[PDB]
């Protein structure tokens, strides 16, 4: 999925993997998150002219797993 945030003049974008903001995942206004298997939250700190704001965030929600198909029981057929 592709996240999208505000473009701010003078800004530096820091994306983090956790609300603790100790480890980076990316640096972009529109980063891609890949191989998503669980709901995942990214946090964003925008620093403008040296001023770092409160991180914003959003959670990418993973669609439910589709149901297993209904097929017939083991069968047997006679040749021909």
């Amino acid at each position: 999925s592709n996240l999208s945030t505000a473009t701010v003049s003078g800004a530096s974008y820091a994306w983090y993997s956790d609300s603790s903001l100790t480890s980076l995942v990316s640096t972009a206004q529109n980063p891609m998150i890949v191989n998503i298997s669980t709901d995942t939250t990214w946090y964003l700190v925008v620093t403008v002219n040296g001023c770092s704001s409160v991180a914003g965030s959003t959670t990418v929600i993973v669609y439910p797993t589709p149901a297993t198909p209904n097929v017939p029981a083991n069968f047997a057929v006679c040749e021909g």
Partner: peptide
């Protein structure tokens, strides 16, 4: 001025890029 961050675009398959 500062050490840059460098990011990969994911795992690469052997012989790829």
């Amino acid at each position: 001025p500062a050490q840059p961050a460098v990011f990969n675009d994911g795992p690469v398959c052997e012989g790829g890029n």
